[PDB]
Design a binder for this molecule. Sequence first.
Ligand SMILES: Nc1nccc(-c2ccccc2)n1
Length: 154
Amino acid sequence: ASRLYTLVLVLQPQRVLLGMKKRGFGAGRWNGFGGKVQEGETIEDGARRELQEESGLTVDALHKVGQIVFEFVGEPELMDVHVFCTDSIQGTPVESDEMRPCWFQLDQIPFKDMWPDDSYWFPLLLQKKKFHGYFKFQGQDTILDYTLREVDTV
Ligand SMILES: Nc1nccc(-c2ccccc2)n1
């Protein structure tokens, strides 16, 4: 019992784009752009669609970088998050009622204001490593247990 989600990081040589979510699940945290995958849509097509919806940016080629499964204790459905990166975008990041994008220098990534799992796998993303992860949360702040391993094929 898992549900597909996407997460996209626009990662350029000296900066990364994050978005501050204004409402719903994850509100108040910086994160990549993503969401649920639709019926009849490929995971990558869903990732591209969500990037546009939430940031205003058009991506063509997305690179698979990771898969992270999230368990929230007391919730039956696991979240199967497919993580992608891109360095080539078109458009200017757009702030909306749902999302405030901002560029960050790589030495200023706002980990204290991100989901806590990001502190484990974001350093792999920055060094161009691919990974498979599993994080068991209690609520939205506490990691009870986790696994995270580098892989050659996502
Ligand atoms: N970084 C991070 N950590 C935990 C959960 C998520 C998430 C990703 C896609 C959709 C909803 C939540 N992202």
